[PDB]
């Protein structure tokens, strides 16, 4: 189907404990394929998926240099941000970045992304047009003015429409056996009495990839959104994901409940009941 490539960068200051740590992780869909950490003994762009390992020394050396420079760039950013908000030198602060591209089944660009958050709050983002910025506050307007003056958006646009898309297409080809394989959820329904008159039904989805899934309970065909406990989708550690949804039902009424599962690895969506 469609695919995404994203880098997720975190820079965090730590006054009195050295310079800010910079870590960058790269993903294709829900699969991490690279990491860089300024706190590593020898900071280097490192492979984290088997299909990226075939890239030669030039790939690793060039990306390493870009990330070493990005470490310094993010430290400059943190200094500037502290000033934009009139903040003390005493506190720790966090700058996060997300950038990359989405492509369709045919490998054509759907859209690009390049956005930033400071201390967990959206700060500035490149608009979908890849030409203009949206600034969250008067501090981010300073960044916007600087980036407009330096025509930064033009550089980001060229990267996102060219380099990003071209490398994503290559990764998808090289990792086709996994990146383009949807593994369906293995499902079952459990039943546990909680008292004489109530029981919980829990619907399980295990071993699926990618993480996107829909898991719902219905009673007599009506969605039970308010009465369903739904845990966050969680990684198993073997590339796959897990999720469950539970409802408390009156004893004897179990067969009025159906669990519905939608996922791209399924031939057809599932309707499950207890037993």
């Amino acid at each position: 189907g469609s695919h995404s490539m994203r880098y997720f960068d975190t820079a965090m200051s730590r006054p009195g404990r050295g310079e800010p740590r910079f870590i960058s992780v790269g993903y294709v869909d829900d699969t991490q394929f690279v990491r860089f950490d300024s706190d590593a003994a020898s900071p280097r762009e490192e492979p984290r998926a088997p299909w990226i390992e075939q890239e030669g020394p030039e790939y690793w050396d060039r990306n390493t240099q870009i990330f070493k420079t990005n470490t310094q760039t993010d430290r400059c950013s943190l200094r500037n941000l502290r000033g934009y908000y009139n903040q003390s030198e005493a506190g720790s602060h966090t700058l996060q970045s997300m950038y990359g591209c989405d492509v369709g089944p045919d490998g054509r660009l759907l859209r690009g992304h390049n956005q930033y958050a400071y201390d967990g709050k959206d700060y500035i983002a490149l608009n979908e047009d890849l030409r203009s910025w949206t600034a969250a506050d008067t501090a981010a307007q300073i960044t916007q003015r600087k980036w407009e003056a330096a025509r930064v958006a033009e550089q980001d646009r060229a990267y996102l429409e060219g380099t990003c898309v071209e490398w994503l297409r290559r990764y998808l080809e090289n990792g086709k056996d996994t990146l383009e394989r949807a593994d369906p959820p293995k499902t079952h329904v459990t039943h546990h009495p909680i008292s004489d008159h109530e029981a919980t039904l829990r619907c399980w989805a295990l071993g699926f990839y990618p993480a996107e899934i829909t898991l719902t309970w219905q009673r007599d065909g009506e969605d039970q959104t308010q009465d369903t406990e739904l845990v966050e989708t969680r990684p198993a550690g073997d590339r796959t994901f897990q999720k469950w949804a539970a409802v408390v039902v009156p004893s004897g009424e179990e067969q009025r409940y159906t669990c519905h599962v939608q996922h791209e690895g399924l031939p057809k969506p599932l309707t499950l009941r207890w037993e």
Binding site: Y7, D9, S24, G26, E45, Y59, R62, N63, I66, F67, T69, N70, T73, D74, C76, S77, N80, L81, L95, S97, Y99, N114, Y116, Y123, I124, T143, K146, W147, A150, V152, Q155, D156, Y159, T163, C164, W167
Partner: peptide, 9 residues
């Protein structure tokens, strides 16, 4: 190169 050059905020 695959990784993006970043710009100081």
């Amino acid at each position: 190169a695959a990784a993006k050059k970043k710009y100081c905020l």
